[PDB]
Symmetry: C4
Subunit: 388 residues, 4 copies
């Protein structure tokens, strides 16, 4: 039976911890995949952590990282949420240097992307077997969310980006039933830039938070109805949610256009509470260190700067990174709504630390109806390892 | 279907061994979690061993133990009873520096506790996904059993402690259905101190044995009816069941109040045989070395000193530690009653041994209708390891 | 539903290989349990390999073997047939320095034995939870088969030995339904000695082949009807099936009494083909080197010396050891009979080799209706390992 | 229920990647089986990777490879497609130095081959338990596909070769229901040589592509109707699909007889698109380096040289090896046809590289209705390892 996901996002006052896998700490002696870009999606029975590999291990010479990023040794694997990405608990998903994965009630539909950048290919597995494919339409680095995709009523929706990373690129919306592509749509958002979207189900539509690697220190926002009609723009909030960014006060904000004349970005998430927003960001405005999350009143609909709450999960004394969204099925939480949960990546090693490798651990948090305290649940490992 | 647990405790004449995992022996070469505070609960299909991690491994530098105890790297994981807590057989349960876990017939309800000590948070997972939360009400080290919780007819009951460890603290009783808190109650036991309760189902009520870290070398006792009405006090027995303690003869005992003017404690268990008690304790009265268990006649209802039986499981030549209670489901043992089974932790390393780490192995015993012989099933490993 | 096992043994002309786990070869780098006394039983869905542990690993210091044999660190674990006994694929069964395990159609009933030799205890687990116990009746090393037990129609039968190993001891027959002992019987076989029986289902009865560690180079034989009435004696065959033994020609044989004035023994198996026997033995008559199996015509009913076939599985250039019996469920093989299959242990290290440890690998063979060729499927590892 | 496999092969314009396991890269630190001859078959729920072992590990001394190839330590194990062949995720299948494995909808029927070359034995396991056997009929190296076998409507068909490798040998066709041999047939193909067939279901019949190790640089072709009536010969295409081979232009081709006066061969696959063929081969015509696949128009029925498409998967800068066929069940892909998917082995070490061992990793590709780009998904590991 198809997992409904038609209900609304739960109004939450805070986030209680879900998991922590300590893989880089475990991987000092264990057999752990050097991973990058973990993310969580849930089936109506369990939540798993996806990630990308080089087919290497921590403390190995194959973790030397000189081995490139967009590589053929790159695969998508999954483990259960909280388990580390180890060799002996991993489930193979796809050959992938960029991915998204999602469940619809029956089977897992994964979409890993590979090939050369000129003509990259994205394969849609479903039930484990590849079912369909999407080819590079623009010929510049075909890619997708790196976070959970979204199925509503058995139809799974997601967002891909073909084009350049700095200048204007092209952005699309795909739609599948049982791993077979049933629809697609182009995103006529000009001047704007959409990357690495964090998305979720909300009142029968798909809301996705994204990253502007062109000109925006604020974050793009897409709204997707199941007929692929769309409204797009930016998170109206007067708080810069991207990184690098500037001061909150030297920032006005816009619901339509990119603000803050900085380049670059980072993957980030947001959650729409009626008219308010749960926005997440790093503490450092220039680095990826720390992580915090703020509820900004009327920040979804207005260029607001009203911080209702400010909860800290990763301290600015510690390294973080990417972040993304997902929901808890009704068939799991017991609610009448969809519990907003999220993950934060914590990057260790290169380029910041004196090592030869680059991996990440995660912490997952999810939406509660109470106020959670500020603490730091950070990575832990004591670098450099023996290999370095 | 909800696991009944309304029946009475089996009258047992002894305890036959259930398991032994030898993880610290296995972990000389294997990949084993440096754990602390293991405990056993059973579903109507299997019994699992819970424990807490630092995300470290035996023989790793991450086992250096200087890494603190109430830490963010602390998680609750489980394995099957008898299996060691290894990376490749572990199931993630919660981020936890203090825990309890229990099954009700359908899903596992875990309750791990984390955060800062000032405002610690306890998350209730159920089916794997967090379902509810309890926040620090007193602002001093929110904590819970470290042993199995108890579900009766689909409602799961447990005991938490907010306050100080030496002086008077505050003690509460929680109640859940499907991971959603449905009740709570304060414990008006003054002068008394309740920590780390070992509990069980008995005639439709929950009996919990606890630890007095204030003034008692005897053990607190709580009786919980499913409406959260309670009687509380001490195990009436004239035998000191806590550690450190004194001689049995320089001990009178009380059914209401703390006896033996020693501080500190250790986690310990007891089992009520009609009017008698199966009480467990270490052999050494000052250290945690050894383990033994005595049936004291009428010791549940009277300040008795009549040892009916004395069975030894861990010898005073060997190290032990915590201990706790649980039952076997009717859906497993085949009985008409609930088989009393228990686990003993065996601590190796710091603070007693010349190492840099601290972990534990366990042995599990359960209630038989025969007299079992005295032997020592101890830890085994030959310390220090190579890392030290 | 209860697995029938009322049918007869398949008449087989040879044995085709089932498995080989190469654990000692795998365990040069892997994480493999130093085991002793492996054996195979099958459920109506799969066959597993049982074994006993010290909680040590190959190449570990904990494999030093000075660590004794009848030890508390001794456990019974299982893996699938062909898989090695590794830490990460092992299922905990019991604390055991002597064991038997069997399935009846619904759950696994294990019987591991432990304690001190004076008052050893045998616990009956069933479904994973201990269900019943048998205590030392004679006070000298309580022990059992080390090979599969036998369930017929939901009742499981086996053979235990309390007494001395050299002189006359005492031998019993137990019977269980759902892990609860429902019957027992003493074996009034005087002068004779019964150890480590290899048993099986045959026409509604249980036939067990055993070892005479007193005075016999031939092998005891027990026949068990499900009311525990018994006929006992020796395998009538004029071929000595035990080891150490003598020449076949300096051996007459007896269907009642022990022949060949040698002491000691080894665990061994046999299979009754109507009136013939498939008897197995080592090639060396003094050491445990090699393994071969001979069909002796009318050897079950008469003191025959007619070798119908002689198949070799382990060559006399290579080390072997114990051996034992089991059947394939109809629910697996598809037959109308019960396929005779067997395992051979291959011991490496101490006492024969220049190492510090002692483990074993296995090969499994089962009954086919064709003539299989003589080859050597031996252990493989290249000793001594790095630890030595 | 029996998996139908009566439908036709999907007409495909290209192949999108299925998996990559990077075991030799993982096995720099992990526990990975030194394997040879991997292959993929799928059940109506999952696809697994089969392989053969020495019971050794990467980076072990037991990987020294001086240990021979046709050895008793040789086993057939399986893992899921994309997972590496590691000790802790492996399922034991058979003792095998040559194999085939296939699923019919209900259980796995494996056929591993062992023994001495003079009188080798092939055992048919089914459901895990050995069910039947085929003995060496010619007395020279009994062997089979090393690739997936084929079940159609519950009857499983495959191809064995008894005889010599260079000169004329003998070739047979077997047929099983539930692991019990129900039919057999001799292949009266004279002058011709058939080895290591890659086969598949196509319109109710079994088409198998093979290797000519005698005189052919082109590839034999067998067509099997379920009554074991056969047509046999060669892939009519004017393109040499074997290796070593010669130029395409110095090659005429034949639909009946072996062309290109070279000896040797390599395992290879083909797929019949109505009248066209998807033929695969290495890039190097003399070595096993590289891999590419060409659709040759009317190449199944005519000595054509019309390359419709040329897709590259492994570049000639990198090592490859064997290759073989299989299908995706309708119960997996969702199609009305049978999706043509294939695997390529990538050999590292001896005999080409400066190591002491020999293993392989794989990539799997499957049939899509789009044109896939040329990229290299190669092995990765950086040789020699530490052991060498
Ligand atoms: C901005 C979106 C893409 C465009 C190529 O760049 C991602 C940026 C980025 C970062 O550090 O911020 C890491 C991401 N990333 C992904 C990876 C691999 C290792 C290929 O998975 N390495 N880096 C970029 N995504 C790619 C290369 O496909
Ligand atoms: C007396 C109850 C608590 C109050 C903080 O102290 C526990 C005592 C204790 C011991 O050695 O006896 C070990 C327990 N403990 C638990 C832990 C960790 C590693 C945090 O799980 N370390 N020690 C204490 N529980 C805590 C700190 O939450
Ligand atoms: C003859 C039957 C028993 C009587 C104690 O002796 C077994 C003999 C034997 C051998 O080498 O032949 C190995 C068996 N054995 C078993 C074990 C352990 C390691 C205790 O499982 N070590 N050796 C003996 N069984 C025991 C000690 O319980
Ligand atoms: C040509 C078919 C057979 C005839 C013996 O030879 C296979 C050739 C071959 C190669 O390199 O091309 C590798 C194959 N092979 C297989 C193996 C083992 C390690 C026995 O599985 N080693 N090599 C050959 N098959 C055998 C020996 O049973
Ligand atoms: Ca930006
Ligand atoms: Ca105390
Ligand atoms: Ca003897
Ligand atoms: Ca050739």
């Amino acid at each position: 039976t198809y997992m409904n996901n038609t209900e609304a996002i739960c109004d939450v006052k805070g986030f209680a911890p879900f998991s922590k896998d300590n893989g880089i700490r475990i991987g000092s002696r264990g057999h752990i995949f050097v991973i990058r870009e973990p993310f969580v999606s849930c089936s109506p029975i369990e939540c798993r952590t996806f990630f990308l590999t080089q087919g290497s291990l921590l403390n190995d010479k194959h973790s030397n990282g000189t081995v490139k990023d967009r590589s053929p040794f790159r695969t998508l694997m999954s483990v259960k949420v909280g388990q580390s990405p180890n060799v002996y608990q991993a489930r193979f998903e796809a050959v992938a240097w960029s991915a998204t994965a999602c469940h619809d009630g029956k089977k897992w539909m994964t979409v890993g992307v590979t090939g050369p950048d000129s003509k990259a290919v994205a394969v849609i597995h479903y039930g484990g077997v590849p079912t369909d494919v999407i080819n590079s339409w623009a010929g510049d680095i075909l890619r997708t969310q790196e976070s959970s995709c979204t199925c509503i009523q058995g139809d799974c929706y997601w967002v891909m980006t073909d084009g350049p990373a700095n200048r204007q690129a092209q952005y699309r919306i795909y739609k599948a039933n049982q791993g077979r592509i049933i629809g697609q749509a182009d995103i006529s958002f000009n001047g704007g830039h959409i990357e690495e979207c964090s998305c979720y189900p909300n009142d029968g539509k798909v809301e996705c938070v994204c990253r502007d690697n062109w000109t925006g220190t604020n974050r793009p926002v897409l709204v997707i109805s199941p007929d692929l009609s769309y409204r797009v723009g930016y998170l109206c909030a007067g708080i810069p949610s991207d990184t690098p960014r500037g001061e909150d006060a030297q920032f006005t904000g816009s619901c339509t256009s990119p603000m803050g004349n900085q380049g670059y970005g980072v993957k980030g998430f947001g959650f729409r509470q009626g008219t308010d927003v749960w926005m997440g960001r790093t503490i450092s405005r220039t680095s990826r260190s720390g992580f915090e999350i703020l509820r900004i009143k009327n920040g979804w609909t207005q260029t607001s700067k009203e911080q209702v709450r400010k909860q800290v999960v990763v301290d600015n004394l510690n390294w973080s990174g990417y972040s993304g969204s997902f929901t808890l099925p009704v068939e799991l939480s017991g609610k009448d709504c969809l519990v907003p949960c999220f993950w934060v990546e914590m990057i260790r090693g290169k380029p910041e630390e004196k090592t030869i490798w680059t991996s990440s651990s995660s912490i997952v948090m999810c939406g509660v109806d109470y106020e959670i305290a500020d603490w730091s649940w950070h990575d832990g490992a004591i670098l450099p390892f023996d290999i370095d």
